[PDB]
Amino acid sequence: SFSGYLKLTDNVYIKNADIVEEAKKVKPTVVVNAANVYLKHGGGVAGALNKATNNAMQVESDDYIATNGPLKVGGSCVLSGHNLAKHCLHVVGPNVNKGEDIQLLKSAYENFNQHEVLLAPLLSAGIFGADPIHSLRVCVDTVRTNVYLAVFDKNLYDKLVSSFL
């Protein structure tokens, strides 16, 4: 199971880890991807998860978009986890760098409540441009299921833990 996580709340855990390496080790039921509405996994967590699947995540995602159209910002879809997890929950947090409503971050985290346990990144953090301290706060105040957060950056991980209220 999940090892080396710091317990933040009853249901939220956090670790300074590469989510790809974490997924390959744990092979969780659900790994969350920091997706965009088009499921174009170019960079950040999405690009790293997709590269770990040898682009199988992108091929599956393009078929999903061809059939269903784009996701909504704040929405999600469940696809295969490929070699990383049983499932991948592709969740679209608002991208502040594309001028999207930061208020949609709570809606994005609500998708996690449909899964009893998840390995996840902080939504809208990194290249999505939101404040990761705010993302962690919304996560703890929205997600009720067991979420194991992987924070890639050590310095950000330390700042998140040391400032956690």
Swiss-Prot record:
Reaction catalyzed: Thiol-dependent hydrolysis of ester, thioester, amide, peptide and isopeptide bonds formed by the C-terminal Gly of ubiquitin (a 76-residue protein attached to proteins as an intracellular targeting signal)
Reported regulation of activity: Inhibited in vitro by GRL-0617.
Membrane topology summary: Multi-pass membrane protein
The organism's place on the tree of life at top rank: Viruses
Domain Macro stretches: 1-165
Subunit structure: May form homohexamers. Interacts with N protein.
Function recorded in the entry: Responsible for the cleavages located at the N-terminus of the replicase polyprotein. Participates together with nsp4 in the assembly of virally-induced cytoplasmic double-membrane vesicles necessary for viral replication. Antagonizes innate immune induction of type I interferon by blocking the phosphorylation, dimerization and subsequent nuclear translocation of host IRF3. Also prevents host NF-kappa-B signaling. In addition, PL-PRO possesses a deubiquitinating/deISGylating activity and processes both 'Lys-48'- and 'Lys-63'-linked polyubiquitin chains from cellular substrates.
Record localization: Host endoplasmic reticulum membrane
Protein name in the entry: Papain-like protease nsp3
Outcome reported for the amino acid change (mutating T29A): In strain: Mu/B.1.621
